[PDB]
Amino acid sequence: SEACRDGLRAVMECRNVTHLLQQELTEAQKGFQDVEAQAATCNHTVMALMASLDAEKAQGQKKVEELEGEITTLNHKLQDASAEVERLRRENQVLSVRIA
Amino acid sequence: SEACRDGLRAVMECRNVTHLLQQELTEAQKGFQDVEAQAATCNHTVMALMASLDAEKAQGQKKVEELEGEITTLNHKLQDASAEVERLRRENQVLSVRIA
Amino acid sequence: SEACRDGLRAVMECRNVTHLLQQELTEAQKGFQDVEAQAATCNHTVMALMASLDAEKAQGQKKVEELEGEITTLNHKLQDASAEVERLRRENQVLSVRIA
Amino acid sequence: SEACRDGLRAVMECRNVTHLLQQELTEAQKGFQDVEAQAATCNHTVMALMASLDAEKAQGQKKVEELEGEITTLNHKLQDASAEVERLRRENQVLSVRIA
């Protein structure tokens, strides 16, 4: 009767509606996937940063070591120079007296 | 990230959309029910009509029987009258001859 | 992460599940259709029954008419016979007296 | 009829089924949320690491500045000592000749 058309359309509509539910589910699926993509990038960026850090510290440490080597080399050469001056000053004193 | 809000909304929508499904499904259920009401009516109207038919036929048959009883009663009373005439015509003939 | 797989499945399921919704909606649709068909039958059976009724009544009415006709015909023929007897009885009486 | 019970159950089912859809949609929602949380952590860990990097580089750069400064200071003091030796050796030579 007239009831049947109504029942029918109701069904038609549940039918139309679930199509929408399916489109939307597909969007939700994309969401999870893009989320996974972004996770992976960030995740890997973190690892890249930790790596630069460890590198930077290794370089820092090494350069400081390198410069510290030079410093003690120079300190040592300074002390030798400074000794030679002390020696010469004395000798020099002695000689000037010897003249007087 | 920005993906999450998208994934979220899509879920929000599948959620909103099924509500609509559920509304529609309730309509569909009403449909089947009202369809059932009309079924019952018609169904019962049929039985009512079959009953009238059987009643009408029973009445018809009985009244015809009733009228047929009267007919054979009359047919019998007719034959009797018709015999009495026959008897009387004869007797009557005899008597008129007896006079002549 | 492990969340993503879970999110995913859930979507997979909503996806699987709506398929079932759709099968079921198709069953529903068949329901209303098989039902419209049943309405039509019942509907038409009703009309057929109303027609038999009207026929039956017409026949009943006509046959009763036909028979009441016969009854008054017979009643009329009875009265005639019944008069003829009355006539003959009288004539007969007269004649028998005439002899005595 | 028998069709109505079938139409009915199919509706019943779509009804039962969507409930499941709704539960699963909630799981999907939880997924995106457990995920958004993770995004934010990672996201913020990234920033923390970029900061340590910029700090480590600043420190590195400063410490190296601090040190190479010392080296050229020493190099300068060395040259001065080394000049004083040169001066004294000469003066000293002159004096020893002056005696002879």
UniProtKB/Swiss-Prot annotation, chains A, B, C, D:
Predominantly expressed in liver, lung, heart and placenta. Lower levels in pancreas, kidney, skeletal muscle and brain. Overexpressed in multiple myeloma cells. Highly expressed during B-cell development, from pro-B precursors to plasma cells. Highly expressed on T-cells, monocytes, NK cells and dendritic cells (at protein level). Residues 19-100 form a coiled coil. Signal peptide: none annotated. GO terms for biological process: B cell activation; defense response to virus; innate immune response; negative regulation of cell growth; negative regulation of cell migration; negative regulation of intracellular transport of viral material; negative regulation of plasmacytoid dendritic cell cytokine production; negative regulation of viral genome replication. Its main location: Golgi. Changing C4A: Prevents homodimerization and inhibition of SARS-CoV, HCoV-229E, and HIV-1 viral particles production ex vivo. Monoubiquitinated by KSHV E3 ubiquitin-protein ligase K5, leading to its targeting to late endosomes and degradation. Residues 1-100 are extracellular. The keyword S-adenosyl-L-methionine does not apply. It is a single-pass type II membrane protein; Lipid-anchor; GPI-anchor. Keywords: Antiviral defense, B-cell activation, Cell membrane, Coiled coil, Cytoplasm, Disulfide bond, Endosome, Glycoprotein, Golgi apparatus, GPI-anchor, Host-virus interaction, Immunity, Innate immunity, Isopeptide bond, Lipoprotein, Membrane, Signal-anchor, Transmembrane, Transmembrane helix, Ubl conjugation. Glycans are attached at N16, N43. IFN-induced antiviral host restriction factor which efficiently blocks the release of diverse mammalian enveloped viruses by directly tethering nascent virions to the membranes of infected cells. Acts as a direct physical tether, holding virions to the cell membrane and linking virions to each other. The tethered virions can be internalized by endocytosis and subsequently degraded or they can remain on the cell surface. In either case, their spread as cell-free virions is restricted. Belongs to the tetherin family. Tetherin shows evidence of positive (adaptive) selection, presumably as a result of evolutionary pressure applied by antagonistic viral proteins that counteract its inhibitiory activity and this has led to the species-specific tetherin sensitivity to viral countermeasures. For example, Tantalus monkey tetherin cannot be abrogated by HIV-1 VPU due to variation in the tetherin transmembrane region. Similarly, SIV Nefs are able to overcome simian tetherins, but not human tetherin, due to a unique 5-amino-acid deletion in the cytoplasmic tail domain of human tetherin. This is Bone marrow stromal antigen 2. The gene is BST2.
